[PDB]
């Protein structure tokens, strides 16, 4: 036992390393997002900046984690990071819906940790998910479905060839 | 009576009453068409900010006419502020034309103020509708139409319409 | 069902709906003092400018409700904003007694507000109402309790007691 | 007849003149209520001072009513400058009183002058009257209605602090 170890649970433990492979996993997607974005018949170089940004927010959520795991006296075990889903996302419409997919399991999974932490009566973890990853989850949810509306009523994929470039314009710009 | 009345006729102090719910009333529409642009089935955070302004205006509008009822020695009266008409705009080009009508409707509201106000013979009353009032729904008036204007040539309920609407004018 | 909500209890949406009527009506009640105090025969400036910022700071609250409840995914339903229960609030430290019942009503509407988050296992919404309304409310209480406390003590209905609160305290 | 001289009835030059002078005798009037507040067994800077910045407005007043006669094309007839109805003042109080009585009074003559121009269609100095006078003599009331009631709502004299705090507190 850990001499910092107090009102901690094997259960929040392990449940805090089954968080930090998922974040690390959700980076990874967005990476692979990306770098489609990125290709030469893609070509849309906002929607590659913005989820660029959102691979290394990720990155930065895991650590978090893993820097909470320390504090509390746990122990971190990592696991593979899988490959994400695909390697083509087909479009930017696509892709913001394969995101909003993503974070809304993200938060899912970070209910089901709240929910641990009160079941075992652990209002530290309660409030440190609170305060650093609940409301961040709401925000990007909300964000994702922004952007989804708006590329849906602008017909982007195939309605409107100008949708993707000027939503990657206009609103990732 | 209160020691600072003078020449300020218990009609005209009704009259506006009356206007300064009218006021909070559009602030209130306003307020409802804003959140409605907040919605993630819409999405046009421009349009959602812009209706948030013409809410605080209006808000402010009214506090002018509480204050001016004070400055006269009227007394100021509230009632309910109604809901309202609906929850759901349906549209851009469709809020852009209720706020046309809403200001139109205040207008009137202020024309018949100052047709009051001249029978009455209060001539301050008059000028405070036409300084404060009467230019500023002209103006809003006349932006609401050029905005309807653009969103109707546009194609708007093309689906760009609304997104670059949002982006180019009231972004 | 909106494409962003997730573990949003109906019950849940209904309560911040009607919250955000109440935060609304605390909007309304505090204009209705603020300007009760800038009658000429009143004419406590200071207390006037007071509750015209709660008034304001209550129309945030309720727009942060608002967002909120676009966030996760319910929808807004507006009714109508009640008339406050005075015009006339009669004075300085009877219109702090008013507004501290006034706080505490708001008060326990969120204590029940974040015991249905509670009971519905909804960790979001139990810290939004923790972060942005549980502790305003208890400063707001004590406040108001501490200026009801020294207008008593200074025999406030001593004819100096609200002259010599409004400059030297809501100043 | 003056070479700029256009919609510019007689009765209307006859009540501008009238006005200056009402307006010069309303500074008078608060001249002499300033240094009524000035006397060593009155004591109150605050109220003298106020009543003296009120003076030097009204004078402002009669003059912006002189620039618009010429800018007319009337001719100025300046008449006695009445002395005040009082030399004692008697109190903070009373005095902002006796200010409320004279500004609504200056007022009164204004919503009349208002109202010939209006009868005799002159749009412009119906303009000059709500531009410059009309909601001045609007903010005044309401000024001195409310400083009213506070010193009343003091115990003023009409608590021997209360003439003082407010000396010090609101005219400060
Ligand atoms: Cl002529
Ligand atoms: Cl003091
Ligand atoms: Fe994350
Ligand atoms: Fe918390
Ligand atoms: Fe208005
Ligand atoms: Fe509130
Ligand atoms: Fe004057």
Redesign the interface.
Known sequence: TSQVRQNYHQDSEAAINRQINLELYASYVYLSMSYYFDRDDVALKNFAKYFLHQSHEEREHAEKLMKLQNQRGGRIFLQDIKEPDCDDWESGQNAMECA?HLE?NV??SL?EL??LA?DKNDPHL??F???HY??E???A??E???????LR???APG??G??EY??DK?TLG
């Open positions: 909003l809304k938060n899912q209910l709240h929910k009160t309660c409030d998910i609170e305060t609940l409301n989850q709401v925000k949810i909300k994702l479905g922004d952007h989804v509306t708006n009523k602008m017909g309605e409107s100008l949708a000027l939503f206009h």
